[PDB]
Structures are given as structure tokens and as C-alpha cells.
Design a protein around this ligand. Structure first.
Ligand code: HEM
Ligand code: HEM
Ligand code: HEM
Ligand SMILES: CCCCCC[C@H]1C(=O)O[C@H](C)[C@H](NC(=O)c2cccc(NC=O)c2O)C(=O)O[C@@H](C)[C@@H]1OC(=O)C(C)C
Lengths: 60, 378, 79, 76, 241
């Protein structure tokens, strides 16, 4: 049982190929998860949105 | 053989930031050269995106900007990055010149001088820049200033109307300024390269003013990454404004269109001309005021002729070190006064600060230098 | 332009160095860091600070007198 | 109950209830008594003289300050 | 007249750093604009569609747009009739010629409202204070006709009638139209009529801080790595003899 960082280096960081592949694969998932958590944090500290305002106007 | 060295193009790039030997020694005060570069391109870059939506014509001028801010997808960040980047371009320009005096960098005549040419041009550019939205400050800002050439004996009148396209500021004046505000940053960008050309002839000065030939490091790693971090810091600041305090450095009244009938008792050029503004009106003269305003900047080109010290940097010069800060604070004074109305305390103190400025650079620092020589037995 | 190899003449100096992957990027960041910035601050307060408080004193007194010049103006006008 | 109803659609405003409550503390009664002293003073010699804009403004500063501090908790 | 006073710090729901506007409060504000200000105050830059994402909804915006009649494009005979209300066009209202604003309100220009919060020092608070400020002239003093009194005003001699307390309403669901409640809402809307981007701006600003919060340390640890070779380098001078 080596180290996380060790195993990480061997399988993905060593070759500049996989190294770069890792970051483009890692950026896609990051943009998504960071935008979720972020906006959520932005809403949680607010709530005078147009989100909770809609419930009132589904009609016309 | 390494193509990175023999290819006509790369050579230049190798010489610019890869193999160029630099002092193992420079510190943060040397970052503002990249920052000014970054500033210049980012300015050119947002500036261009605004031009695909801006207009000119006095009727639509103001309207287009608001169009951008409200209607143009993302036009607001672009507009505000442009306007805030403009201020940052001054903070750095200011810091750069600062670094320069303190450390004696000005001993590279050609380089220093190109830098003065670089100063006047970005000043001349940014001036035209704010006339564009056609706000209140834009109109009289564009009026109070330009006029100054009317103080020039015998022909002042002719020139000010020639630069105007009429008898006042209108039609002919906004289109003119837009076009000039468009072509200048390109010309500046060229001059910058010549600035940088002459700089490579000697390599960089450093915090000690000694000479680092005995200890140079490659721009590769070292100053490329120390330029990246640095640029990130410049982004933090520019974004702090744009995204949290968009109008903090902006005069709220360049909102509300023009009006050759009005003039709102206050009016000052953008912050970065305040020290200069203060100088000019701290003189009861049309000719003297503008003459003094000119000297206020054109004196940089005089500094090297008054280097008196046997050491280059002020790193080991307490006396001058004191007069340096007195200069900075005093400029911070002029900036503050410039920002105030021409009334009671404010007049006499801004009048003293002016004299100080010129007496400090023209008599005090040069003498501090000689005394230090004498103290050291030099 | 000037390249390495044509810079200048150096006599007898040895320079030992170490791989970045073999050392810490932040040796004693705080342990040795703080003490040093105290030391550099101390070393320079006296030449940097004074002109700024001078401006500081002139700034607060300056606005003071600006208000007390007009607002305070009346004052007395008794008849 | 029913008397308070007419009181609503005909009166009521959180600004006045607060103004009067703020017009009460130290700096205010003092800034009003500097203002009343001058009020009497210029309408005493009720003819041919100066102004009194000044003493009013100092009162409104001190009030409107503490006005802003609590006021907004009542609104909606 | 030469002396002046500046506004206090009303704790707006959007004064804090990452603080969104109150969309419910932007609504009531538009109402205050339409019923009251709109018959004197031009608002050349905002439009009914601008309201769509903000406060109202699709159909609602259409309806409010239809409650006026604007002069549409000319037709075949070179006409220029009138039409219900789209969504497209703005709120160009009160007067044609600018001097016609002067002919109505005695020689005074009620300036555009899109401006306002960013064209006057203090922003919302100056407009909030100027509206709920309205006080009575003490001694000395004068006035021409009805050049009303206001302390929060340059010179104190305005030409604007105090159209505050005239309790108008339609605060759907139930909201007391008191002077102060009415002033907060106009301002809150006026903030949004000047800086619509306001909330997105700060949303990004959060990400900007949050991003830089990971990057600054990182791009800094990177530079350390590379400079560490230089930082721990050891010199020895070994001259002959
Ligand atoms: C278009 C605006 C300018 C740009 C883009 C620019 C760019 C640069 C760059 C990249 C450097 C090398 C890095 C550094 O030392 O920071 C530099 C150094 C220098 N510049 Fe500028 N600069 C500009 C304005 C100025 C000004 C205002 C001056 C002084 C009037 C100036 C005179 C110098 C001098 C003397 C140096 C040498 C600094 C040293 O060796 O320590 N340039 N500049
Ligand atoms: C050649 C690239 C540039 C272009 C295409 C450009 C074009 C424009 C346009 C169309 C405007 C009016 C829109 C607006 O005000 O937001 C503007 C405003 C301005 N830009 Fe530029 N400009 C460029 C480079 C610069 C430079 C080098 C500076 C100096 C830092 C500069 C500083 C300004 C200033 C001060 C304003 C007006 C201030 C304000 O927005 O309130 N821009 N520019
Ligand atoms: C809540 C609705 C209204 C608001 C928020 C409003 C707000 C304002 C503001 C902020 C100013 C300029 C203040 C300054 O220069 O610093 C102004 C000027 C004026 N508006 Fe209004 N107003 C409203 C309704 C009216 C109405 C109903 C009238 C018709 C009596 C009116 C006629 C004026 C006039 C005559 C001025 C000129 C004041 C002057 O510059 O001398 N406005 N208004
Ligand atoms: C397009 C980007 C490629 C770069 C080529 C052009 C840019 C260029 O030439 O790059 C190098 C990086 C040039 N010098 C430095 O940065 C620099 C020099 C000594 C020390 C430091 N830092 C810390 O000690 C530096 O940062 C510098 O920073 O000058 C810019 C103004 C120029 O930029 C310009 O010309 C403009 C006219 C484009």
C-alpha cells in the first residue's frame, strides 16, 4: 500500500499525455461541481430571488 | 541543434523571456513592467469589444454605452473592466516610475526616456478615453483641459479650435477623439517594444544598484512564474473593482449626458490627473499655470541630469530615502487637494505642495545626494 | 543583448544547490517569516512613515478648517 | 379593534413613530435647543437680519443617523 | 444655500458585499414609478422586457406593457397610429420636448430615473432621504412660489412637489403603503433601474473570491517550488592559498 499521491503520479502524472488528459477530464467535473456548490452558497445567503417568487405565478 | 535559438522568430522570444539573464535579485517592484504590458493588451482587448457596439455621434454616444451595459450580453463586465483597467494602468504606471527613481533605473537614458514617451501617450490616450461616453465630466473635462493650449502665446486660440473642429466641443470633437483613442494604444504598443529593445541592451537594474552580472539567473522558470503570480494579483485587484465596487474610482456625473449650458461646480479630471490639476491652478496664471502643469511631468526627463550621488540605488541612502517618501506623500497631497474645491485651506496648502514638489526634485534630492557623498568620504 | 557565457569573470566560488522536489517550498514560513518582516519593517519605518503622518496631520486639519471656515462662519453677526 | 382599523387606512407610518423617539435622545434635544435658541433669536428681533439654516441641519444629522439604525426593521 | 448635509446609512437589503436585491421590493417600486413618478419622470432606458426576469413574469409583462399606447411605425399612407403595448419598447413617457417639462413643473427638469442612484452622491440613500426627508423651512429663509423645502438638497430650494404620502396602492398580497415603505421600494427599484447586472455581478464576485482563494495560494506554491533552488543555495568562496 503506497501513497495516494504516489499511485496518482504513476498512473496519470508521469506522462504529459495522461497528465493533460487528467486536467481536461478534471476541469469538466470541476466546472460543474463548483458552479453547483457556488450558486447554492449564493442562494442560501439570499432568498429574495425570482426563484421562490415563481410559486405564486404558474397561471398567467 | 536547438530550434528555439536559431529560428528568426523564436530568437526574439528566447531573448524576451526564456534565456535572457536577469538579476537573481529583483523584487516585486519589477513586476509592473509585465503588469503594464498586461494592462496594455487587456485594455486593447476590452476596448475593442466595446468598439463593436459603441458609436460616436453626440446623439447616440451616451445611449450606446448604456445599450452595452444593459442590452449587450455581458457588455457590463467588458465596459467596467475597460474603465477599471484604465485606472489600474495608472496605478502601475505610477508604481513603475516610482520603482525607477528610488532605484536609480533612470541611468538607462534611452530606456527611461522612451518610458516618458510611454507616459505622455497613455495619459493622452486615457484623456480621450473618458470623453467618449459623452457625460458631464466628459464634456467639460474635454473642455477645461484642451483649452490650456489657448494659453500658448499668439497661436493658442488657433490650435484649440483646430483640435476642436469648431468653436466649442461638439460633432467634430467626439469622432476625432474616438479615432485617436483607437490608434494610440497601437502606436504605444510599438513604442513599448523599442522601450524594451533599449532595455535589453543593458539588462535590468536591481534593488542594490550594484551590478548582478556576477549572479544572473535565467528568465526561464524564475521570472516567468514570478510574473504569472504577479499578474494573478493584478487580476484580483481589477476584478475587485469591477465586481464589487465598479464606480468607486469613477466620477458619478459622467452619468447624466452632456450640456454646454451647465457645468457642475466641482469637476476634476479622473483621479490620475489630480496631482497635475492641483499644480496648474495653484498658480494665478493662464500661461504660468499650464507652463507649470507641463513641467510637472516633463521633469522626469530632467531627473538623470540631477543625479549627484556616487551610488545608484537609494537602498543604502537614508537621507534620500527620506526625501523620496516626502515626494510620494506630497504627491498624495496634490492628489487630495486636486480633488477639493478652490477654497480656503485647500488653496494655500496645495500652493505649498506645488513649490515643495519642484523644490524637492530640483534642489532637495540633488543636495541630499551630495551630502551623502561627503558623509561616506566620496 | 547579452547571453550567459559572455557576462563577466568569476574566480573561485562554489555553489551548492538542491532539487525542488527534494526540499520544502515553505521551509519555516511563519517561524522564520514573521520575525523577518518585523525586522525589515523596523529597519525602514523611520524613512517611510514620517512623511505620511505629516500628510495625515495636514489632511485632517485641512478639512477641519474647511468646514469651520464656512459652517462655523456664523458665528456672530449681532446688531 | 374597529377604531384601530380606521387608524390604519387614514394614518400610520413607522417614520414618525421613530423620528419622535429619536428626536428624544441627548444630542437631539440639545441640537433642537441650539435650534430653538436661534429660532427665538432671529424671530425675537423679528426684523431686518440673517439666517438659521445651520442649526437645523445639525439636528437632522443626529436624528436621521439613529433613524437609519433602527427604521428598516419595521418596514415590511 | 452654500451649506449642506449628507445622508445616513440605511441598511439596504443589498448594502452587504454579496447581497442580492429584494425582487419583491423591486416590484412594488416599479408600481411606485408607474402610478406616481411616471407622469413627470422620463425613464428612457428601462423596458417592460427588462422587468421579465427580474420581478414580473412573461404574461404579466405583456399586460403592463399594454396599459399604455405608444406611437408605432408609419403605415403605407405615412400614418403613425397607436397600439396596445408590446414588451419591446421602453418607458419614454411624460413630455416630448425637454422644455415642455419646464412648461409644466415651473421651470424645473425632473431628470431621467434610469440615471439616479449612480448619478447622485450617496446613491439610494440620497434619494431615500430626499423623498422621506421633506421638512419645513425655519427662520431666515424665503421661497419663491412652491419651491418646496428639502434639507437633503443642494441649496435647499427644490422645484419638486413632495409626492410621497399620497397613499396609492396595489401591493399584491398585502403591503401597507406608508411613506417610508413607499420610499424604500422606489429606491430599491431605482437601484435595479441603474445597475440591473447588480446581482450577477456579485454572484460572479463570489466565485472570483472563491476561485482566487484556491489559485492565489496554488500559483504561489508553484513559484516557491521553482525559486526554492535559489532560496536554499549555498555559497562558498575558496581562493587560492
Ligand atoms: C507603456 C507603459 C510602460 C510599459 C509597458 C513598460 C514596460 C516595461 C517592462 C516590461 C520593464 C522591465 C520589467 C520591469 O523592470 O518592471 C520596464 C523597465 C523600465 N521602464 Fe518601462 N514601461 C512603461 C512605462 C515606463 C515609464 C513610465 C518609464 C519611466 C518614465 C519607463 C522607464 C523604464 C525603465 C527606466 C525601466 C528599467 C527598470 C529597471 O531596470 O529596474 N517605462 N518597463
Ligand atoms: C485600442 C484599444 C482601445 C479601444 C478599441 C478603446 C475603445 C474605447 C471605447 C469605444 C470607449 C467608450 C465605451 C466606454 O466608455 O466604456 C472607451 C472608454 C475608455 N477607454 Fe478605451 N479604448 C482602447 C484602449 C484604451 C486605452 C489604452 C486606455 C487607457 C488605459 C483606455 C482607457 C479608456 C477610458 C479612460 C475610457 C473612458 C472611461 C470610461 O469608460 O468611463 N482604453 N474606449
Ligand atoms: C417617487 C416619485 C419621484 C421621485 C423618486 C422623484 C425623485 C427626484 C429626484 C431624485 C430629483 C433630482 C434630485 C437632485 O437633483 O439631487 C427630482 C427632480 C424633480 N422632480 Fe421628482 N421625483 C418623483 C415624482 C415627481 C413628481 C410627481 C414631480 C411633479 C411635481 C416631480 C417633479 C420634479 C421636479 C420639478 C424636479 C426638479 C427639482 C429641481 O431640480 O429643482 N418628480 N425628482
Ligand atoms: C504577447 C505576450 C508575449 C510577451 C512579449 C511582450 C512582453 C515582453 O517582452 O515580455 C517580457 C516578459 C517583458 N519583460 C518582463 O516582463 C520582465 C523583465 C524583467 C523582470 C520581470 N519581472 C520580475 O522581475 C519581467 O516581468 C515584458 O513583460 O514586457 C511586456 C510589456 C512585453 O509586452 C509588449 O511588449 C507588448 C507591446 C505586447
Amino acid at each position: 500500500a503506497p501513497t495516494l499521491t504516489a499511485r496518482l503520479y504513476s498512473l496519470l502524472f508521469r506522462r504529459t499525455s495522461t497528465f493533460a488528459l487528467t486536467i481536461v477530464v478534471g476541469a469538466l467535473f470541476f466546472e460543474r461541481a463548483f458552479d453547483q456548490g457556488a450558486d447554492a452558497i449564493y442562494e442560501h445567503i439570499n432568498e429574495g430571488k425570482l426563484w421562490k417568487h415563481i410559486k405564486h405565478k404558474y397561471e398567467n | 541543434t536547438n530550434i528555439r535559438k536559431s529560428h528568426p522568430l523564436m530568437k526574439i522570444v528566447n531573448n524576451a523571456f526564456i534565456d535572457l539573464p536577469a538579476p537573481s535579485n529583483i523584487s516585486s517592484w519589477w513586476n509592473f513592467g509585465s503588469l503594464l504590458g498586461i494592462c496594455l493588451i487587456l485594455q486593447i482587448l476590452t476596448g475593442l469589444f466595446l468598439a463593436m457596439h459603441y458609436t460616436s455621434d453626440t446623439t447616440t454616444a451616451f445611449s450606446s454605452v448604456t445599450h452595452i451595459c444593459r442590452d449587450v450580453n455581458y457588455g457590463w463586465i467588458i465596459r467596467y473592466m475597460h474603465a477599471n483597467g484604465a485606472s489600474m494602468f495608472f496605478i502601475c504606471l505610477y508604481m513603475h516610475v516610482g520603482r525607477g527613481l528610488y532605484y536609480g533605473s533612470y541611468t538607462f537614458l534611452e530606456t527611461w526616456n522612451i518610458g516618458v514617451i510611454l507616459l505622455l501617450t497613455v495619459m493622452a490616450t486615457a484623456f480621450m478615453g473618458y470623453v467618449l461616453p459623452w457625460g458631464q465630466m466628459s464634456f467639460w473635462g474635454a473642455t477645461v483641459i484642451t483649452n490650456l493650449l489657448s494659453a500658448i502665446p499668439y497661436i493658442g486660440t488657433n490650435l484649440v479650435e483646430w483640435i476642436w473642429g469648431g468653436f466649442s466641443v461638439d460633432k467634430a470633437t467626439l469622432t476625432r477623439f474616438f479615432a485617436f483613442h483607437f490608434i494610440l494604444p497601437f502606436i504605444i504598443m510599438a513604442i513599448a517594444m523599442v522601450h524594451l529593445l533599449f532595455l535589453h541592451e543593458t539588462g535590468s537594474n536591481n534593488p542594490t544598484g550594484i551590478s548582478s552580472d556576477v549572479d544572473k539567473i535565467p528568465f526561464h522558470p524564475y521570472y516567468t512564474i514570478k510574473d504569472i503570480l504577479g499578474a494573478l494579483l493584478l487580476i484580483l485587484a481589477l476584478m475587485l473593482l469591477v465586481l464589487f465596487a465598479p464606480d468607486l474610482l469613477g466620477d458619478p456625473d459622467n452619468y447624466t449626458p452632456a450640456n454646454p449650458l451647465n457645468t457642475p461646480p466641482h469637476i476634476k479630471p479622473e483621479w490620475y490627473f489630480l496631482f497635475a490639476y492641483a499644480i496648474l491652478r495653484s498658480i494665478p496664471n493662464k500661461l504660468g499655470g499650464v507652463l507649470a502643469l507641463a513641467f510637472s511631468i516633463l521633469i522626469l526627463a530632467l531627473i538623470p541630469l540631477l543625479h549627484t550621488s556616487k551610488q545608484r540605488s537609494m537602498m543604502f541612502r537614508p537621507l534620500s530615502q527620506c526625501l523620496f517618501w516626502a515626494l510620494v506623500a506630497d504627491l498624495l497631497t496634490l492628489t487630495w487637494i486636486g480633488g477639493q474645491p478652490v477654497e480656503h485651506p485647500y488653496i494655500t496648502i496645495g500652493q505649498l505642495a506645488s513649490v515643495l514638489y519642484f523644490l524637492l526634485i530640483l534642489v532637495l534630492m540633488p543636495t541630499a545626494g551630495t551630502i551623502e557623498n561627503k558623509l561616506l568620504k566620496w | 543583448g547579452r547571453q550567459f557565457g559572455h557576462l563577466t569573470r568569476v574566480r573561485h566560488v562554489i555553489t551548492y544547490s538542491l532539487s525542488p522536489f527534494e526540499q520544502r517550498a515553505f521551509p519555516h514560513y511563519f517561524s522564520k517569516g514573521i520575525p523577518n518582516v518585523l525586522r525589515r519593517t523596523r529597519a525602514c519605518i523611520l524613512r517611510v512613515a514620517p512623511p505620511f503622518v505629516a500628510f495625515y496631520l495636514v489632511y485632517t486639519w485641512g478639512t477641519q478648517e474647511f468646514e469651520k471656515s464656512k459652517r462655523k462662519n456664523p458665528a456672530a453677526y449681532e446688531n | 379593534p374597529k377604531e384601530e382599523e380606521e387608524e390604519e387606512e387614514e394614518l400610520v407610518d413607522p417614520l414618525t413613530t421613530v423620528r419622535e423617539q429619536c428626536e428624544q435622545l441627548e444630542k437631539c434635544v440639545k441640537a433642537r435647543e441650539r435650534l430653538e435658541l436661534c429660532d427665538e433669536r432671529v424671530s425675537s428681533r423679528s426684523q431686518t437680519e440673517e439666517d438659521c439654516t445651520e442649526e437645523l441641519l445639525d439636528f437632522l444629522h443626529a436624528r436621521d443617523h439613529c433613524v437609519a439604525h433602527k427604521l428598516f426593521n419595521s418596514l415590511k | 444655500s452654500d451649506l449642506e448635509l449628507h445622508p445616513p446609512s440605511y441598511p439596504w437589503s443589498h448594502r452587504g458585499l454579496l447581497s442580492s436585491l429584494d425582487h419583491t421590493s423591486i416590484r412594488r417600486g416599479f408600481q411606485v414609478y408607474k402610478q406616481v413618478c411616471s407622469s413627470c419622470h422620463s425613464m428612457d432606458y428601462v423596458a417592460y422586457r427588462h422587468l421579465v426576469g427580474v420581478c414580473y413574469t412573461e404574461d404579466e409583462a405583456k399586460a403592463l406593457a399594454e396599459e399604455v399606447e405608444v406611437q408605432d411605425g408609419p403605415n403605407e399612407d405615412g400614418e403613425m397610429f397607436m397600439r396596445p403595448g408590446k414588451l419591446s419598447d421602453y418607458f419614454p413617457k411624460p413630455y416630448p420636448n425637454p422644455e415642455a417639462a419646464r412648461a409644466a413643473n415651473n421651470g424645473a427638469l425632473p431628470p431621467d430615473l434610469s440615471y439616479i442612484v449612480r448619478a447622485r452622491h450617496g446613491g439610494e440613500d440620497y434619494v431615500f432621504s430626499l423623498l422621506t426627508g421633506y421638512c419645513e423651512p425655519p427662520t431666515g429663509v424665503s421661497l419663491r412660489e412652491g419651491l418646496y423645502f428639502n434639507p437633503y438638497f443642494p441649496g435647499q430650494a427644490i422645484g419638486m412637489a413632495p409626492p410621497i404620502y399620497n397613499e396609492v396602492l396595489e401591493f399584491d398580497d398585502g403591503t401597507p403603503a406608508t411613506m417610508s415603505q413607499v420610499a424604500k421600494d422606489v429606491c430599491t427599484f431605482l437601484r435595479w433601474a441603474a445597475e440591473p447586472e447588480h446581482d450577477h455581478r456579485k454572484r460572479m464576485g463570489l466565485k472570483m473570491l472563491l476561485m482566487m482563494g484556491l489559485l492565489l495560494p496554488l500559483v504561489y506554491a508553484m513559484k516557491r517550488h521553482k525559486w526554492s533552488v535559489l532560496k536554499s543555495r549555498k555559497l562558498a568562496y575558496r581562493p587560492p592559498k
